[PDB]
Ligand binder design. Structure first.
Ligand code: MG
Ligand code: MG
Length: 64
RNA sequence: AAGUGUUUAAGGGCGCAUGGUGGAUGCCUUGGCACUGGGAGCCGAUGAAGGACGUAGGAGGCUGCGAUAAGCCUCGGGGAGCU
């Protein structure tokens, strides 16, 4: 999705906004998929990327 | 008139040529056995060994993986092929 350095240089408020929005997008796209009106898959994996990145960066900033 | 006599195979046996079933024989090795020289001699409450269940675009199974589910990041090695 974005560069890990992109959201490293991006702020905590923007990153929480992004985590909100991207959880929403995971939700929405994953279950449009589950509705089975689609053809591809990698969207779930990309949102996996973004969730893991946000979670890791939040731990990092919260720990030090 | 007389006495003399092969002349057939329902089947069978023997050989010969053909085949049929059964898979030994010969040839092969990703498999095993036994060693040598090295490495490592533990794994676990930061939740182990081993399992249930799930995980794919596709129904099951094996392999990996774990609702973040044939996987995710960051760093380094390779490439025009991969899912
Ligand atoms: Mg399995
Ligand atoms: Mg490298």
């Amino acid at each position: 999705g974005t560069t890990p350095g992109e959201l490293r240089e991006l702020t905590d408020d923007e990153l929480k906004d992004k985590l909100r929005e991207s959880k929403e997008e995971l939700f929405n796209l994953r279950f449009q998929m589950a509705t089975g009106q689609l053809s591809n898959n990698r969207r779930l994996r990309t949102v996996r990327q973004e969730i893991a990145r946000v979670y890791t960066v939040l731990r990092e900033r919260e720990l030090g």
